[model samples]
Target chain A: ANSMSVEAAKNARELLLKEYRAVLSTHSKKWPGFPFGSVVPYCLDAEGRPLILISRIAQHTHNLQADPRCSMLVGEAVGRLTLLAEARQLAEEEVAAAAERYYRYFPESADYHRVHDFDFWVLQPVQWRFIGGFGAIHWLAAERVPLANPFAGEAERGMVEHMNSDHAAAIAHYVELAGLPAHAAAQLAGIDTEGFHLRIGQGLHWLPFPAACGNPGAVRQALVQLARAERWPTV
Target chain B: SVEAAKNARELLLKEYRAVLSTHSKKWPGFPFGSVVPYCLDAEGRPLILISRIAQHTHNLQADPRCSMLVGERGAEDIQAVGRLTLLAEARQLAEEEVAAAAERYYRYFPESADYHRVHDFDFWVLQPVQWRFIGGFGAIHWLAAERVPLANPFAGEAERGMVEHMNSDHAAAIAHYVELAGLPAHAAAQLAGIDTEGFHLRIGQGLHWLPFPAACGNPGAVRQALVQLARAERWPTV
Candidate 1:
């Protein structure tokens, strides 16, 4: 039998990175003291916190304004990760950076970003509840789990843009390596230490480096090796 | 405003499952949510058959305040789909209402009949006090309980009879509806249930909802809607 204590946080983070949509519950402002649930799309920040872009006119936004206490439920099937967190709306200066991170995962939301009503908010999880199938459950404090993303903040965008703009052929080669249909139009959507995401037509693919990288320099080194290997096949 | 209520009520009756939220008694002041299968009661309230041992059941018992969020399933972007969040108070059914509630719940979830018998679950009804409906982005409205429409005219025996009649005699119509709804055609389709706003069909392993152009308040109205639909599509009369 697998020991849950050993795998809980890793499993939770895996689910967080795998699923983009979640059910967000917040205290209702219209009906005070009531909980409201809404479907939301989110991306993970460097600290593994969930970042969401919601409209000002949304009921959830009103709820968060009145009270910051909220929880996001993610995952499907039998395993689910519930993160109880506090909502913090980003400042005007911070919104653009956060919006770029969000738009990476949800490219379709580009139009909504231009709209004045939409704003970005991040959920800082104080604790999390992970249900790993039947009889495997754990409640973990945020500190106990892996929190920081090696590639966070400004560096993440810089890396993604550098690769998509300068290494377009290499990205297409990676897509071809992943057994997906090759398209010259493919572009890098997002990148992190573990891997980078590519947008090929309407589909997204995750291409992992041989190992994780902690900084832009390391990311560049890993991509260089990957590109070299793609050019020269080794048996 | 009335249009909003109609849209909300239509969504409620059309969707069979929703995310049920309850104030957690275990973790005081924290909201706990779970995916639940539900059906509408005689009064348009949601009826959920839950086991007594479930965490949600315990939460409801401690505090009846709850909410059910229903929306269009299988949408590319769920946030853009029409959704309604009904804020209601939950009350476990007394012995007298269990049989009827069981029948209504079983119509949509026929496979649950065995589980219901084995688990000895209790049926709880949620009476809406307030609701928020989002037809889509920038189209949000709130409706008080009074503004929401009451139970469909075909709630009880009429609904059950209509479902049985259609499943047994109008298989072609159900298949036609599956095609008309833009769902992949199935080998067979069974009429699961019907309400004022629309009807549900069990196509293969999936359940699909197709809304009528307008609400059909009674059996006669429902028949007229079906006839008009068939005539428009040039389908053979049932």
Candidate 2:
């Protein structure tokens, strides 16, 4: 593969992992031929697709119910990603697991679906337009963009919960090591092969491991070493 | 009423970037979202210089109707803050119109200078059709385009002369404005553009617009407003 395209895709994927908020553009059912833009916060599912919880009464929800086709614009100015996807509203059975993952990242939105009529929808990637600032542009097929996380289910939950509860001092070490705000205590958000996400006072930060940890044991080893390290590693 | 419109306009002035929703050509009926950096034109409309080959440009070409979404740039809870959805019809600028757009736009985004020729870009202005302003919860209103974006009386020569004079002679005043506004102190701020209600300060890549204490109908009024701002201990209550 050419270095630039490969590097661009890597940069684009990194931005996707780090940033949690995006502007969702959907066809406006109210305005017919017009498109509407709205803000949304999202977390990646196991498949690295954007999973969003939107209010059923909101304009975006009505528009999506009418037409599921939408795009999420992430980042701005430099290094932007325009992900074109079809939103698939999760079934009742699927909503259970989706809620668990979402609640971990956004504790404030816990039980919103039960009380506030929110629905979980995953943006199934159709195509990606990654602009690594200015002219380094590439149009990637859906398959080329998302890298499936092997540890999305039981493994991820176990690791995150263990870190948040039993490893408070370790997380504090991480917050300081990663240069996060030390005013408030942090929580371990999510972890994948690449790195783990730290939720520090309304901000979600992604810190990479020394190398990709493909297995459960590998991830555990990386975490233990990271907590004891003097400085963050380069990978 | 008027309070809501000003609140909505404040979000626009504070945020330099917006998400543009355009009717997609590639996906048939789907809406495409693209991030664009913009500055308000003299008419109080958003001016964007987009690439000819970009998807949004193609979308705008196929259909002129669109909406631009502006809000707080980095809000942890995006829905908690005020956001504006501006419905508009896009109009591509003519060759005669390109110079002013280029001059004003380049001053704000110096890194993107000469992109029009290099990237085959065209200036497109979003003429407001209607606005949906939501000030958090309990505050939702359909704002007429005329309600926001007061026209800049000093857009051309008058604005340029004042901005040039301020940059040349009033460096400390500009720095004072920056300090008072609490902008990034990594680089010195320069006056980018001027209007009746406010002026833009280019601090590195960021454009911050500080509103005057009151509207300045004439140049003399504008000067008084500037001197007053430069001398004020704190931003005066408007």
Candidate 3:
């Protein structure tokens, strides 16, 4: 993969973060060598890799077990961004944290999480192709892309849990700031360096930090500042 | 198996677009997937218009092996929706059949009419060899080529005439058919296309296909089916 331009990297990351689902294509094991397209719901992990939860019995999971080479076609309306990546099953140690991040955006899937057959898999993109409408296309290598969520992995899990468990009002305030309809409750879904996602009623909202936070301590400070500003608005 | 086939036929006749997967000749063994707008020809074969320069067109010319995935459109959980994957071989239509194919294609995608004239596009028909139908999460069935039916008797000219006749004279009846199909009432309903299994209704940009209680093999059968539906409008118990 060759290095990508800053503009291309930003476009690619934004497309991935904005869309919650993609059409996942994998090599078909049953048919020897055919591509099978399936609709999959996904979320980005800390480093910006696509994360998905699938059942062991599902054809896609079976296909990945044999060969992990796959591509996720994301985006809609203007154009589609195809992430050519390889699927890697999370290690037992990594599953819990990955599940936590995933459940934040797709709270309804909490029941599916308890099902023993399901497991989390991350897609590590080696190359990306962005089709920004007709005749406009660009390819970028993974190295050229921006590093996702500086506070990914363990730090991300800690921050998400802390905010959701202790600062429900703050999460709801972010929702109010976005001018969305008031809901009974809002829980911190997930957070990265750039911003945090909130699950308000049936919808999910993204709230950007005033400044990107690189670590958990910085994330706390950003949240504190946001809370203060919301409570005491200056004229 | 019979029930599954009936369900599969209903899904195929209803949906207008699908995920077309073709074996890529450029990348050697890799399979490429693209979303395609399509309409079923009389015998239940899928007809698609492809640009001469499109990657799928190039792939089909080299290797005709492909499959189309069609499913219910607005389901909350896509995995739980009914979907059918038709595995078929694509054959480009001969120049002689282009006129007929264009009329059929245009009925479903009216906006494509300009592209049909200006673009370097041609029609190709997919002859199904096998199909895998997933009725839902637990129900899965595979149907072979031999089991698939050919184009209905009212295909081609007869279908065209019926569509024109219905839209021209029976506008009220077409709207009534839409109501019977369990769709919301639309002020304007036109007969867009027809097949042995069902007929399509166009209300604004939205198209809906409603299946007859049973297959209509000929124009007489189609008329009988329509008369029965019209009569039911007055005799609600029927």
Candidate 4:
């Protein structure tokens, strides 16, 4: 591929990976049942194994048992990165260590793990059909958009906390200006050298608002002004 | 559900008012051009105030179940494409309701408020019964009750066959413009089909279709020609 082609491919792959870890929905063609899916928190182990957390009794678990082959789709509802990938179940004992690593990606789910009904299952993708722009499509490979680095390791966690905490006032300022409803709390979801990712919600309503501040200093300054105007209690 | 639908409706309202509003006026008799205004009732039905003698008003009176086409200037024309068709029953509202609907319509397009207030401009209230939203090439779904009919503007076997031919064969040309068209990427990106000659453009969000230009040609010919020229090689389905 030429330089431009390579760049486009790289950009496309990156976009796909960013939308990885999405809700996988499926139904049994043979059995009469309601279509079901789950919010599976997953991560790639050092060996590139896809580790997921789920109870063996979960419907997906039962379904996976019936049919090892399944499809997984990830991405936002309307925004870009919507994709579909075919996957299959992995042995529990094989990815137990990997499952622990996956938990690190989503600490909020720790509470659910304590329940007896909650265990773990892994889905390893075999093929993918990624639909991006209206008519644009691409068949993908395993390496097309790897999720090995969902977040930039431990080094960036500090910056993530600072942005979520000290910068809460700034975050609240933009939220108000955006005309979002009240009581909507913002929690940082992930982070990298670029910036932090936020999950904004109130009750069951939540959306991921990932931020990559090119100029962190300017963002901080802008937030201060907004804080003064909104009179947000958070610092 | 209400809030999500409301947000979705608001998005649709802004989009139609922006992109399709301009082209809907291009139909020969429409003099206002970009100034065409629309109103949405509390239930999110599209309302238009037109002169009693206007072509669309006359058409509405003849057949209350009418369709509005809202497609970006350059977008692929595909079947199962997103477009909103109102199986509406138009009513000449009482003077009070007409006056109220007119006020909200004018508030959005303040410049055209006088035009709306004109005594000749009669109100045509539209209530939506079915919505067909197609995400892209084959992502099609309908938001309809059990017994709603899905109309195909083309008549007879030949016309139906032609509609499929253009949609499948000449898709590339539509995609070329739609994907690369400078006319608002976000808006154009949502367009899946445009049958202007048939007076429709299928938009992705909530199956919204806007008024397409009519003078270009008849529906079948326009769609057929556009499709044939869109792709380099035709792939026959059957």
Candidate 5:
């Protein structure tokens, strides 16, 4: 039992680190043009860089024009919530790479992403503060956190890419199973070592899903049940 | 024209006492509790009577240096805001001063003569080093005044005349606001304070505070209302 507990702790640590990476790489669009903040939800590339999908006319796009440096915080909810983060600005090539991840997470935007009106951009982290638990705070050293292949040999990455790319039905399948609301436009916000976070508020029930194959299967089954109930469709 | 500084000083003293009525932390379970009391003379220093077993007594024993808040309640034209006066050192009264101090208090609270005969009561004389007066909202000034403890002016004849005139003349105004206004003899009994415009409202045990302005109203209205109430309620006159 002790050995098992030790293993679980190791897995939890790895999961937390992975979750942090996913959130850091994802783009948190802060539009400066608007006095109040407008966060444009976006996903991360395999290298864990932000990939934003926005129109040139969008306020966030305008704000980025003035400043490219920004930070994004991703967290889990239970009691107060566990926050993990990263801050960065993306290079030109990073934007292109993020676009690939964006397409994989949100294929519906394939046609509009690269167009002059709607475009993609990347974000990188410069500094980060993460409160993992009540009174549990950590400041991650820049060198300690790597900004590389975010998925790093995960079999589910293929599944995530496939469902987001060619299999919308499967994504819908799990989404219904998990009791999450279906949206017209939904995409992977971030993926850490443990799971993938789905952006669904304006889109419905934003949440993070564990990447464990069994949990993903359960989520898909739940979505199938929901879809069968026909409640996933907006009346 | 009264110099601004002099007018401000007199206003500070009058208002400082008034403000303490609202700001001093009231004791829980007691309806109206005042943490501040008059600091009278025990030689040349400022002294106050307190109970040895009381919480404040214990606190004073632990820390000889303490502070008190003094100010008048906010009124329409002359709202003296409030002030915090710091007392840096104090000497607990010896056995001799306790008897004399008890007599002084009895003159003002003759009805409590039987109660003062009990043991826990004690007197403490504080040696004030400096005085800090907060004149207006958030504005503070300090004064280095000589510490010459004064008599309880409220116990004297001048104060009695002041209370009588204020209550008798402003009977109608005070009755309108205060609940215990109808009983003429009761009201006359309740009249407190040294002068016409000043009176004390018993909010809690061992706590009698001045309420120049009882409600949110003009200064004259507040003074008149309090006087009328004092004339209406029956009080201890021993």
Candidate 6:
């Protein structure tokens, strides 16, 4: 309820949203008593919960099957965000949009999702631990970190496809403005109220729009503005 | 198994940092993760310096059972690359051990020169309990501590002489190694340490370990590999 938590929550949400990969630490069934850690790629779901594609036979997945408790550490050292959550796999009926959104952020995983034994699981937040710096550390409630995407469904998909297909120049411009690597072609991964993600080859770069957009039209206007601007605009 | 261990060891050697995951002493039940830059000690274990005030340090103080996850950096598909997790029990070094650990550690991470004495930081080495390594897809193995770390056969004087000689005499050769490795261009590279497997080149605070074409059990063979690599077109094949 206080302003301090809200400030910390906003910073934590932004940091969580920027990264595509995190080290998932789980309760090891194999080596009982000790925690097991492994690398996993994840994206924020519609409600901002982390959606990860994991294999059926993997150790962490097996660990989660026995105990849903786990933590995902986004970034490292100094300023970092860690989410402690219970893992739940999506039912067959719930996999459609989740598949689409995840594939947008990670196109290379389409085969594994389609052909392999990988399943979609979301980390249901229980608590969030965020360290802003030396003294700025807080233990936040589950509700504090995930911001519900204002544009999660068809609108989000339409915006992303439009940017990738019709606005290649502008996409390249955004990559250039952000100083992201141009070694491989860049693609628009997704759009939200605060910013957008550009998937360049294997790396993902999150660039914020000058300001938050209230709706699809506002997002359009911001994109258009960024396309022509010589330098990345700062609010 | 040796092939898996070899690849796994290389991942740990190349990456100068690892994610330290430990049980949270503050919240309890929850596992905490944070980055800790590490260098392999003389005994082929991870040596870390942490302030007594840091969360991870406190976590280890409460429970020494922890895991250090090191993965390939700058990879396109992180999952498709290598990730090595060393589940270990951390033991704080003795006063006699700190000076020796610091001598080797500071070279790889010269930025932490003052933190050892100025800050109330202590050194802890992770003794591996079990090792889980995923070397690309389907190359997964759970290895023992003995199999994962190649004990530093060239510790103390043998290692120190090789490092100093490279920095003092082979400046251009060091530069050539940097270009050959395609490492960072911001700073001139210097040889920090050498092992039977490879040598670490510290560019700024970043440490990159380049392996010899073959294992060099002796300093003379390591020197030959270095000189051979200097004039070679690409990393020389055996």
Q: What DockQ does every candidate get?
A: 0.50, 0.74, 0.30, 0.01, 0.02, 0.77
Off by over 4 Å in 1: A91-96, A106-119, A133-135, A166-186, A199-211, A215-235, B228-238
- How far residue B22's Cα lies from its native spot in candidate 5, in Å, is 37
lDDT of 6 by residue, B130-177 (tens): 999997875789998789988898876788888998899989998888
Better candidate number, 3 or 4, judged by DockQ: 3
Better of 1 and 4 by TM-score: 1
DockQ of 5: 0.02
Docking class of 4: incorrect
Docking class of 6: medium
Tell me which of candidates 3 and 5 scores higher on DockQ: 3
Ranked by lDDT, top first = 6, 2, 1, 3, 4, 5
lDDT tens digits by residue: candidate 4, B32-127: 111124545434456677777564465455545433333221221212233332233456677777655665454334445656445567766655
Question: What DockQ was computed for model 1?
Answer: 0.50
Model 6 lDDT, residue B153, Cα = 83
- For model 1 the TM-score comes to 0.85
Encode model 5's per-residue lDDT on A1-235: one tens digit a residue: 3554344333333333333222111111331111111224455455544456666754335545654533343333211111122223455565555555555545556767546567666554443344434534444433233334435334445545555677566556646656666645454543444345554533323333333323445645543444465434321
Residue-wise C-alpha lDDT for candidate 2, range A1-235, written one tens digit per residue: 8777777777778889989999899988877878999888998988988999988778889999999998898874478898989999999988888898889899999999889889999999888888876657788878777878998877899999998889999999988888888778999989988888988888788888899999989999999999899999787
Clashing residue pairs for model 6: none
iRMSD (1 decimal) for each model: 1.8, 1.0, 2.7, 19.3, 24.9, 1.0
Superposed model 4: Cα runs more than 4 Å off:
A2-52, A75-108, A150-159, A169-183, A193-195, A202-235, B1-238
Which tens-of-lDDT digit does each residue in A77-182 have in candidate 1? Answer: 5788888788999888877777767778788888575666788898887778888777477888876554577676577878888888889888766766667656
Mind giving the per-residue lDDT tens digits that candidate 6 earns over A1-235?
6898888898898888888889999988888878888989888888988999999889999999988988999863358899999999999887988898998898878867669999999999999988887757788999988988878778999999988899999998888888889998888898888899998878887888899997999999999999898999985
Task: Give lDDT for model 6.
Answer: 0.88
2 or 4, which is superior by lDDT?
2
- Candidate 6's displacement at residue B170, Å, is 2.4
Docking class of 3: acceptable
> In model 3, what lDDT does residue B147 have?
58
For candidate 6 chain A, the 10 contiguous residues with the lowest summed lDDT are A73-82
lDDT: worst 10-residue window of model 2 chain A: A132-141
